[PDB]
Amino acid sequence: NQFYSVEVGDSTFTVLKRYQNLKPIGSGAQGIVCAAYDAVLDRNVAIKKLSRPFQNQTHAKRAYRELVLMKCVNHKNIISLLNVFTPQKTLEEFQDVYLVMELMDANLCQVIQMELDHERMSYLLYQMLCGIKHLHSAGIIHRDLKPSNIVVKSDCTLKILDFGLARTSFMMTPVTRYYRAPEVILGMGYKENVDIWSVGCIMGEMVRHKILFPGRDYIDQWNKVIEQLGTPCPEFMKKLQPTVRNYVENRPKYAGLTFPKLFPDSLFPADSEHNKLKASQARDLLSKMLVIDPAKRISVDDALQHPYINVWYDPAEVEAPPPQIYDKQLDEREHTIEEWKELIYKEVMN
Numbered sequence: 453n454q455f456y457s458v459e460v461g462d463s464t465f466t467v468l469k470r471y472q473n474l475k476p477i478g479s480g481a482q483g484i485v486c487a488a489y490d491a492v493l494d495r496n497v498a499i500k501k502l503s504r505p506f507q508n509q510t511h512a513k514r515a516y517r518e519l520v521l522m523k524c525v526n527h528k529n530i531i532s533l534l535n536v537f538t539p540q541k542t543l544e545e546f547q548d549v550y551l552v553m554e555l556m557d558a559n560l561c562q563v564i565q566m567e568l569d570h571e572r573m574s575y576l577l578y579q580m581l582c583g584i585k586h587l588h589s590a591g592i593i594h595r596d597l598k599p600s601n602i603v604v605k606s607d608c609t610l611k612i613l614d615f616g617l618a619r620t621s622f623m624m625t626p627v628t629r630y631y632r633a634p635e636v637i638l639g640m641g642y643k644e645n646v647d648i649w650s651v652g653c654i655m656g657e658m659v660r661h662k663i664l665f666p667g668r669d670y671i672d673q674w675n676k677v678i679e680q681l682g683t684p685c686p687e688f689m690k691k692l693q694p695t696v697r698n699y700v701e702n703r704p705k706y707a708g709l710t711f712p713k714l715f716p717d718s719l720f721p722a723d724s725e726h727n728k729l730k731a732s733q734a735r736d737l738l739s740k741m742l743v744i745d746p747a748k749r750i751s752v753d754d755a756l757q758h759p760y761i762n763v764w765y766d767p768a769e770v771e772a773p774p775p776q777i778y779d780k781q782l783d784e785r786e787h788t789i790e791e792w793k794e795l796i797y798k799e800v801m802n
């Protein structure tokens with residue numbers, strides 16, 4: 453037998469014998485993740501056991517799309533698949549999927565808690581924009597980027613873990629919704645720069661060490677948006693739905709706080725000329741990402757040209773060729789659970 457079983461993270465992992473000393477590092481609706489030592493490669497890996505991938509079609513579609521995209525994308529800021537396996541021997545008995553990834557050291561939530569340092573902050577944001585640009589060039593518009601879905605190594609290298617809605621913006625989760633763009637929440641449709649709002653939310657959270665737009669539901673979240681950024685222009689209420697406009701237009705009108713008041717100098721490293729320069733540049737970039745109307749919001753390509761980020765720009769990292777997803781009808785075609793299962797089983801078997 454090439455497999456062995458170990459109970460870890462209150463779950464039974466049945467894995468290849470090359471993977472040793474499993475230790476829980478994370479959990480969620482998608483699955484349970486362990487760190488492990490891979491004796492074949494002499495390196496530490498992360499193993500994700502997918503949680504109930506065939507419980508329904510949303511789980512099955514998510515599992516198939518995650519597996520296909522993690523194989524096909526090859527980029528330093530997107531997590532890569534090192535191995536995938538199932539311990540079951542037939543399609544009839546097939547139930548469990550294990551993804552093996554390179555082990556990162558922390559997620560971005562943990563990193564966000566550290567004291568803001570402009571070299572680290574700008575580098576993390578640069579890498580996020582690099583990964584997002586690469587996903588966008590393949591038609592993958594994430595729409596649910598959040599700090600828990602982004603992992604970081606001790607040397608501050610950064611990888612995005614998941615693909616959001618991919619080449620599909622309704623999201624049935626069955627969650628953390630504080631990073632979703634106004635045009636997603638309000639049901640207006642989206643373009644590529646929907647993901648820039650989420651980066652802006654993460655960036656503002658790195659500076660304030662508080663969630664920018666927290667709240668129990670989207671009603672509360674929208675109130676936090678307009679209180680801080682101001683009631684949007686009627687050119688936006690016009691693009692808005694004639695029904696949902698009524699609630700939004702009848703909210704109290706807010707001027708919004710200026711970005712100097714939203715992100716005051718008190719939040720930034722002080723008392724060097726370099727730090728004074730960088731506070732102004734960071735606030736300027738925030739003011740161009742945290743824009744309610746996506747028609748007025750900076751693009752990924754222009755954010756990479758912004759002076760706060762562009763110090764890091766290397767064409768070899770930014771301008772890599774787009775992945776060719778030959779598997780069309782992905783994120784559009786629906787299938788029965790049995791059909792998704794066969795599709796996933798073929799992908800696991802390579």
Ligand SMILES: CCCCCCCCCCCC[N+](C)(C)CCCS(=O)(=O)O
Nearest residue numbers: 621622637638639640641670671674696
């Ligand atoms: C303060 C919270 C308000 C929540 C408002 C809920 C709004 C309901 C959304 C329905 C919009 C459907 N259409 C217009 C067809 C666009 C669908 C395309 S996409 O899904 O927006 O990409």
Ligand SMILES: O=C(Nc1nnc(-c2ccncc2)s1)C(F)(F)Br
Nearest residue numbers: 478479480482483485498554555556
């Ligand atoms: O946390 C989750 N997913 C993850 N996927 N990969 C992860 C990882 C962690 C550390 N190093 C490498 C990879 S954690 C979830 F299941 F709750 Br959606």
